[PDB]
Amino acid sequence: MFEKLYSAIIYSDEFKKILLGRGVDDLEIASAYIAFLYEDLPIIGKNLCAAFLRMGLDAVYNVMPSGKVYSPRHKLYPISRYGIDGVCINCDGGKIILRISNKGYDPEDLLESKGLESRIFVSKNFKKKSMEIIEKIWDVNKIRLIARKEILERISAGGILHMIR
Amino acid sequence: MFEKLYSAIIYSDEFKKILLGRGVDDLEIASAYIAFLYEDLPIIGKNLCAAFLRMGLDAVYNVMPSGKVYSPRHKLYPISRYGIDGVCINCDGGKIILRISNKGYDPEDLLESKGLESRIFVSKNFKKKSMEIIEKIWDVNKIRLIARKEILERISAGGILHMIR
Ligand SMILES: Nc1ncnc2c1ncn2[C@@H]1O[C@H](COP(=O)(O)OP(=O)(O)O)[C@@H](O)[C@H]1O
Ligand SMILES: Nc1ncnc2c1ncn2[C@@H]1O[C@H](COP(=O)(O)OP(=O)(O)O)[C@@H](O)[C@H]1O
Ligand SMILES: [Mg+2]
Secondary structure, eight states: OTHHHHHHHHHHHHHHHHHHSSOOOHHHHHHHHHHHHOTTSOEEESOHHHHHHHHGGGGGGTBOTTSOBOBGGGTEESSOOTTOOOEEETSSOSSEEEEEETTOBOHHHHHHOOOOOSEEEEETTHHHHHHHHHHHHSOHHHHHHHHHHHHHHHHHHHOHHHHHO | OOHHHHHHHHHHHHHHHHHHSSOOOHHHHHHHHHHHHOTTSOEESSOHHHHHHHHGGGGGGGBOTTSOBOBGGGTEESSOOTTOOOEEESSSOSSEEEEEESSOBOHHHHHHOOSOOSEEEEETTHHHHHHHHHHHHSOHHHHHHHHHHHHHHHHHHHOHHHHHO
């Protein structure tokens, strides 16, 4: 069921390593959860994994130099424009501000949440908790090598430089 | 004895596909042969394969968006400048001019060459004949696959954006 969500988090994580030398964040992975739940909610800010969840490999063409995705068709924005009442992953604009707290949802406890509130918070170490869930269920290293080879096949289609425009 | 030369031709072909989405030219391959005979001769324009021969994976950091390499430490120059008495791959600068001809050198005959003419010529389908040699010696697919893993390993650790500077 969460097969769409956990795949996004592995693929975004590999692509981000190819593109910026590092892997996805606590809050960037959190954005994939929020979007797995509310599929017509605009995700503003650090939103790379939501963008893989909604766009597949095609997010690769829309990622800004910041790792934020602009793709208004899939309601992904890097900053808040007028009238977008979306979730702001680590920013103060939009309708709903998502950041980190001691007493903030876990990976499990967030999937459960039935409402959307004016302020959303997620637990420290959200990525570590979410990688363990995926690890117990999948062979993640077999997936990562398959992810890298497909992302490279994408990038090599028109070449890195094409993909930058 | 020629392994190092034939590895550069297979590594550059995999790297150019990742950067510009297409293989290497007849003349880009020819430049590597030249780099192999004349270890101090400066090579000007169309030098992606001579760059791998002279720099290894460290060439990825010195590629212009044209796929020409600028590394003066290694006597590699994308355009001719005053006083660089080198071979010019498919330009009219420097001292020697390398260009395709109907009668030009073969891979075997260019290797066997002893002089340095004021004008070298390589046969049409220099790349075809050169890939037909290398394919008789190794399972090239096992190489391209390794070259990719190592090219990606290099790109990734920096981040594609660090590398494009
Ligand atoms: N640079 C491009 N190259 C090829 N096709 C494109 C390009 N830009 C847009 N399209 C196409 O135009 C249509 C509109 O897409 P668009 O709304 O521009 O995408 P996005 O919401 O990701 O910015 C789509 O069918 C898409 O496939
Ligand atoms: N990880 C890296 N390892 C080695 N060289 C790098 C790396 N990242 C970037 N470079 C760049 O590659 C180039 C290779 O050296 P070169 O231009 O020949 O001599 P110099 O050291 O004088 O700049 C340098 O311009 C350097 O800034
Ligand atoms: Mg060409």
